[PDB]
Amino acid sequence: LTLKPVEEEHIDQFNELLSYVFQVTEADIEESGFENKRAFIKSKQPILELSKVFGWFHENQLISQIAIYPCEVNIHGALYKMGGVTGVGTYPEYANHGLMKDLIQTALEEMRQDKQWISYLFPYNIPYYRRKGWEIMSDKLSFKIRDTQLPKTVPVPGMIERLAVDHPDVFDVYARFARQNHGALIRSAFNWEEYWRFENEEERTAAVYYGANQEPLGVLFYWVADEVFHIKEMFYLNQEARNGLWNFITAHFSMVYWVKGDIYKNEPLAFLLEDSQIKESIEPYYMARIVDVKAFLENFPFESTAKPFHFVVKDPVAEWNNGIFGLIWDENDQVTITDEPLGTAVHLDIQTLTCLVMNYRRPSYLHRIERIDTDKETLNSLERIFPDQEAYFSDYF
Amino acid sequence: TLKPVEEEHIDQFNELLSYVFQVTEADIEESGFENKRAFIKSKQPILELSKVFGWFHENQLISQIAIYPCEVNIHGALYKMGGVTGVGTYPEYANHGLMKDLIQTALEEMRQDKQWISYLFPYNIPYYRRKGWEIMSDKLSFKIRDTQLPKTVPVPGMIERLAVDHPDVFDVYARFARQNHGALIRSAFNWEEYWRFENEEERTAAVYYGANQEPLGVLFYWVADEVFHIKEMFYLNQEARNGLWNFITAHFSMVYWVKGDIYKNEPLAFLLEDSQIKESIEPYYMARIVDVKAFLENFPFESTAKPFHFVVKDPVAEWNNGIFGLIWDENDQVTITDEPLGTAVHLDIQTLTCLVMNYRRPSYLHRIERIDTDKETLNSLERIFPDQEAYFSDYF
């Protein structure tokens, strides 16, 4: 067996393996406008030619593979290069042999050289990927509210236009949304095609809310079908915009029995309605992994300063993430990341640290459930320095 | 006339309640009681302790409310709590503003009885919010496949199947409530009400005992039709949590699905190996600050702050309106003033109640424009308000 990069030549093979593992629903293949799922996976190929791709070869057959798609994301206000793992798969035959372990090893080595200090991953197998060091970074919420539970109109100064989903104003609002919302993908025109690849864009519309200035501040992607108002999602730069969009939705009362939508961050709708007695479902949506602890931390926008302490980190795959990471802020509250166990220890594994930095859970909770080992004082330090915002992420790959 | 309702008005009360009380046709038989005419008359012992008021169409009871005296844990401190139960108006009489006056009377009586916080099951969320209540806690519901059950974790303790009224169940819950924000401190009477809609005979308590033979965790469950049902689980530490889950997972061969509820906003999924489950999250209970100054002078603030003041709007209680300055003395103890000390924090009673229960954080509430204040004071609010999710599994 040979583990090597996969090339131009091998791309056909890459695709074939990918159909055999791709867990796309039959419903989503129909909605996408692609006849079958081979046509569907052949549209993913422009992603692959951007990515670093590796595989195992039963020479010269491709039997297992991993790709790293280069992205950029918002981590608490800082733009980080991100390694997006896609196209992962082993042929069911070859699953006992720790093939994927080495691909992941390889991929992490590549991500580190590419200065990708954080990696996102859609979870095909949470338990497997958690053992390789990933942790959940974000939730997706789903709700279904009765027409009878729709919110009362809030006075707003602006107006709504119904626009094509690829109107330039949509892109502009998202470019700013991503820059002020933790977790988010910074999108190119190309990430936007991928955003719409399971759906017929022409059967969707963007309700865009314009402030009194005719500047767009909010986007609702929706369609009406069989007396349901369908919300793909909404994103808004402020409360006025949110309220404008909800005003537009509640004006559809006489057209619909229900309103169904998703929210791509753990921020339940229920509280924000006057009738909060709805059921929402909450599911983990994406995972993340710190690739290089030191380099991650030294770019991290810590909220505040602290007495010096240090992380003692265990990483089950990446050698360079084991050991001591000391933090010290100087007079100008500027941080440096040391190798010195200066101050009290905080013992955790790579999963838990990634959870911390993505704020999927807070330090205290993780201490409480015995995933962080340190003392009360340092635990207060963590709570002070780690920002408290819920990750947003809308993309798929 | 509106007047206290007494021993003689007890059946009327129980009728009105049986009428407007939506309980499910399924859950009525489950109690071991036939319909809501021998089942609502087991509810009688709540009321002898409670303060009950009503409206009488002379001399029939047409609108009513009850305040059941309880004690609860708020961020570690014990508070007397006024539990509003059995509220309702007959549909004929429904649009005359009767309940608003019963609520005023209720709130007045809670102030007198020194109940600075009130809990209320949300029958009509929009209505009670307009009267000053807000959501305090969530209930989470899960359904996990046998195939997603957690891997066994080594523990030194042991499990036993006990009856749900074993005294070790009561021991563990008495300790649990003392260390979990939101929780009802249970009287023997609250425990018999816990099991009102349910046949205790057909439920079992699996109790985990640690090495030193002390009970540390309880699981209320039953197996029916190859589903493992979990009423709930409470536990004093993670060792107990694991040993309770070890027991559950041991039943893999017996079931396809594990279904249960969690009476706190702490999702299960994260704590599982296979976290890929959907849980539903729903508002479970409402709370209300009865008296702002009194509540706050007893409140276990996590920290001290540069003095500031709330400016509070309350749509029912006069005495909850206005300014409430906060300053901490040299014993780190707060004193609550009339004086506009420092920067103002504008909010209503619903969102103040939301803060003290920690249903949402200050920065979130500010962000959605339910708190009006500056960046420095917001940072203070975030420092002084403890961060725990409220647990509450009782019903009334």
Q: Most B CBs within 10 Å: which of A136, A137, A150, A282, as the mutation test of the B interface?
A: A282
Q: Which of A270, A274, A388 sits opposite B283 (nearest CB)?
A: A270
Cα dist. A198→A72, A232, B13, B201 in Å?
A: 22, 12, 57, 52
R_g of chain B, CA atoms, integer Å = 23
Does A276 sit within 8 Å of B280, measured CB to CB? no
What is the number of other CB atoms lying within 10 angstroms of the CB of residue B134? 27
What's the start-to-end Cα distance of chain A, in Å? 28
For A340, other C-beta atoms within 10 Å of its C-beta total 11
DSSP A318-333: -GGGSEEEEEEE-TT-
A175/A35 same-domain check: no
One DSSP character per residue, A74-143 reads EETTEEEEEEEEEEEEE-GGGTTS-HHHHHHHHHHHHHHHTT--EEEE--S-HHHHHHTT-EEEEEEEEE
For A139, the closest chain B residue by CA position comes to B278
Tokens (6 digits) for B346:
């504008």
Instruction: Record the resolution, in angstroms.
Output: 2.3
Give the 3-state secondary structure of residue B93.
helix
Cα–Cα dist B394/B137, whole Å: 12
B360 touches chain A (CB under 8 A): yes
Within 8 A of B387 by CB-CB distance, chain A residues are 362, 364, 383
| Residue from the list A274, A281, A284 with its beta carbon closest to the beta carbon of B275 | A284
Probe site for chain B from A275, A351, A379 (most B CB atoms < 10 A): A275
Question: Which of B266, B291, B316 is the endpoint of a domain?
Answer: B291
Which chain B residues contact residue A142 at CB under 8 A? 278
Rounded CA-CA distance B337/A282 in Å is 43
Closest to B309 measured CA to CA, from B324, B294, B330, B319: B324
Neighbouring-strand partners of residue A230: A223, A260
Amino acid (one-letter) located at A270:
A
SS (H, E, C) B98-140: HHHHHHHHHHHHHHHCCCCEEEECCCCHHHHHHCCCEEEEEEE
Residues of chain A with C-beta less than 8 angstroms from the C-beta of B361: 388
Please, how many CA atoms are within 13 Å of residue B223, restricted to the half-sphere of its CB? 13
* Residues contacting B293, CB < 8 A, separation 6+: B324, B336
CA pair distance A90, A93, nearest whole angstrom: 8
Q: Do the Cβ atoms of A162 and A116 come closer than 8 Å?
A: no
Of B76, B267, B297, B298, nearest to B182 (Cα)? B76
Burial of residue B188 (CB within 10 Å: 0-12, 13-18, 19+) is exposed
Q: B181 and B76 in contact (C-beta within 8 Å)?
A: yes
Residues of chain A neighbouring B279 (CB-CB closer than 8 A): 281-283
Q: Quick check: B147 and B261 in contact, CB under 8 A?
A: no
- A2 with A101, same domain: the answer is yes
Question: Do B154 and B183 lie in a common domain?
Answer: yes
Read off the CATH number of the domain in which A318 is found: 3.30.1050.10
Question: Would you state the torsion angle of the CA atoms of residues B86, B234, A353, A77, taken in this order, to the nearest 10 degrees?
Answer: 0
Q: Say whether both B356 and B265 belong to one domain.
A: no
Q: Cβ contact (<8 Å) for A278 and B282? A: yes
Supply the CATH number for residue B107's domain: 3.40.630.30
Measure the CA–CA gap between A136 and B122, rounded to whole angstroms.
Answer: 32
Does any CB of chain B come closer than 8 Å to the CB of residue A8? no
CA of B149: which chain A residue's CA is closest? A127
DSSP calls for B306-339: S-EEEEEE-SS-GGGSEEEEEEE-TTS-EEEESS
Q: What domain range includes position B394?
A: 136-284+387-396
| Distance in Å, alpha carbon of B140 to nearest chain A alpha carbon | 9
> What span, in angstroms and rounded, lies between the C-alpha atoms of B372 and B289?
19
Cα–Cα distance, B87 to B84 (Å, whole number): 7
Buried/exposed code over A134-160 (b: 16+ C-beta within 10 A; e: otherwise): bbbbbbbbbbebebebbbeeeebebeb
Judged by a CB distance cut-off of 8 A, whether residue A7 touches chain B is no
Give me the number of domains chain A comprises.
3
Distance, in Å, from the CA atom of A120 to the CA atom of A77, rounded to the nearest integer, reads 17
For residues B201 and B332, membership in a common domain is answered with no
Residue B388, token pair as written in the block: 């725990």
A20 HSE (CA, 13 A, CB side): 14
| CA–CA min distance B151, chain A (Å) | 11
Whether A283 contacts chain B with CB within 8 A: yes
Question: Residue A173: which of A387, A357, A358, A394 has the closest Cα?
Answer: A394
**Which of A262, A235, A233, A265 lies closest to A360 in space, CA to CA?**
A265
Show residues of chain B in contact with A276, CB under 8 Å. Answer: 122, 125, 135, 283
CB A58 within 8 A of CB A97: no
Whether residue A275 sits in one domain with residue A144: yes
* Sheet containing strand A309-314, strands side by side: A335-338, A323-329, A309-314, A344-349
Beta strand B117-120 with A205-210: parallel, antiparallel or unpaired?
unpaired
> How far off is chain A from B29, nearest CA to CA, in Å?
25
Closest to A323 measured CA to CA, from A315, A331, A332: A315
Backbone phi, psi, residue A271, to 5°: -60, -35
Contacts of A274 in chain B (CB under 8 A): 125-126, 129
Give B70's Cβ-side CA count (13 Å radius): 31
**Are A388 and B361 a contacting pair at CB < 8 A?**
yes
| CB spacing of B269 vs A277 below 8 angstroms | no
- Per DSSP, A185 falls in state B
Separation CA A195–CA A221 (nearest Å): 12
Q: Flag whether residue B152 sits within 8 Å of chain A, measured between CB atoms.
A: no
Residues 319-358 of chain B whose Cβ lies under 8 A from any Cβ of chain A: none
Cα distance between the two ends of chain B? 26
CA dist list (Å): A299 to A85, A283, A338, B14: 22, 29, 13, 64
SS3 B16: helix
- Give A 246-275 residues with CB within 8 A of chain B: 268, 270-272, 274-275
A239 vs B271, B274, B369: nearest CB:
B369
Most distant pair of Cα atoms in chain B: their distance: 67
Method by which the coordinates were obtained: X-ray
On whether both B278 and B338 belong to a single domain, the answer is no
Count of positions (residues) in chain B: 396
Q: Round the CA-based radius of gyration of chain A to a whole number and report it.
A: 23
With contacts defined as CB-CB under 8 Å, which chain B residues touch A361? 270
For β-strands A228-236 and A118-121, DSSP reports them as: unpaired
Name B260's bridge partners: B142, B230
Q: CB of B279 within 8 Å of any CB in chain A?
A: yes
Contacts of A364 in chain B (CB under 8 A): 387
Query: Are the CB atoms for B73 and B234 separated by under 8 Å?
Result: no
C-alpha B377 chain-centroid distance:
29
In angstroms, the separation between the Cα of residue A191 and the nearest Cα of chain B is 25
Q: Do B269 and A279 touch (CB under 8 A)?
A: no
For residue B293, give the H/E element and its range: helix B292-297
Determine contact: B125 vs chain A, CB below 8 A: yes
Same domain, A91 and A147: no
- Domain end call among B258, B291, B324: B291
Q: Do A127 and B273 touch (CB under 8 A)?
A: yes
Burial class (CB in 10 A: 0-12, 13-18, 19+), B91: exposed
Which among B280, B359, B369 has CB closest to A280?
A: B280
Q: How far apart are CA A137 and CA A130, in angstroms?
A: 12
Contacts of B270 in chain A (CB under 8 A): 136, 284, 360-361
Query: Can you read off the two tokens belonging to residue A176?
Result: 């700013």
Alpha helices, DSSP H only, in chain A?
Answer: 11-21, 26-31, 37-42, 45-48, 99-113, 126-131, 168-180, 189-195, 239-250, 293-297, 350-358, 363-368, 376-385
Phi, psi for B305 (deg, rounded to 5): -145, 160
- A42 lies in the same domain as A101: yes
Nearest chain A Cα to B141, which residue? A281
Taking a C-beta distance cutoff of 8 angstroms, is the pair A336, A312 a contact? no
Say whether both A21 and A105 belong to one domain.
yes
Distance between CA atoms of B172 and B234, rounded to whole angstroms? Answer: 8
Q: Which residue of B has its CA nearest to A137?
A: B270
CA distance A270 to B134: 12
Cβ within 8 Å of residue A12, ≥6 positions away: none
Cβ contacts of A337 within 8 Å, gap of 6 or more? A294, A297, A298, A325, A326, A327
Q: A283 contacts in B (CB within 8 Å)?
A: 269, 276-279
Distances (CA, A) of A314 to A267, B149, B231, B240, B260: 31, 26, 37, 26, 34
Same domain for A247 and A156, yes or no, is yes
In sequence order, which residues have a C-beta less than 8 Å from that of residue A56 and are 6 or more positions away?
A: A1, A2, A3, A62, A63, A64, A65, A90, A94, A99, A102, A103
**A76/A137 Cα distance (integer angstroms):** 13
For residues B56 and B1, the answer to whether their CB atoms sit within 8 Å is yes
CA distance linking residue B289 with residue B327, whole number of Å? 20
B166 vs A: CB within 8 A: no
Phi, psi angles (nearest 5°) of residue B255? -145, 150
For residues A256 and A228, what is the distance between their CA atoms, to the nearest angstrom? Answer: 5
* A291 within 8 A of A318, measured Cβ to Cβ: yes
Q: How many CB pairs under 8 A join A and B?
A: 75
Cα–Cα nearest to B296, from B321, B316, B322, B325: B325
B299 in contact with chain A, both atoms CB, cutoff 8 A: no
How many C-alpha atoms does A243 have within 13 Å on its Cβ side?
A: 14
To the nearest whole Å, the CA of A389 is away from the closest chain B CA by: 9
Residues A23 and A164 placed together within one structural domain of the fold: no
> Is A361 in Cβ contact with B270 (below 8 Å)?
yes
At B301, is the secondary structure helix, strand, or coil? coil
Asked which of A292, A327, A350 is the last residue of a domain, the reply is: A292
Residue B125 to residue A276, Cβ atoms within 8 A: yes
CB of B359 less than 8 A from some CB of A: yes
Q: What are the chain A neighbours of B273 within 8 Å (beta carbons)?
A: 126-127, 130
Measure CB to CB from residue A284 to each of B125, B269, B361 and give the nearest one.
Answer: B269
- Token pair belonging to A210: 């314009």
Handedness of CA B363, B369, B375, B377 (dihedral sign): negative
Pull the structure tokens for residue B8.
């003689």
* B299: amino acid identity, one letter: F
Of B258, B102, B379, residue with least CA distance to A304: B379
Considering only CB atoms, which chain A residues are within 8 Å of B368? 239, 272
Chain B, residues 189-218, CB within 8 A of chain A, namely: none
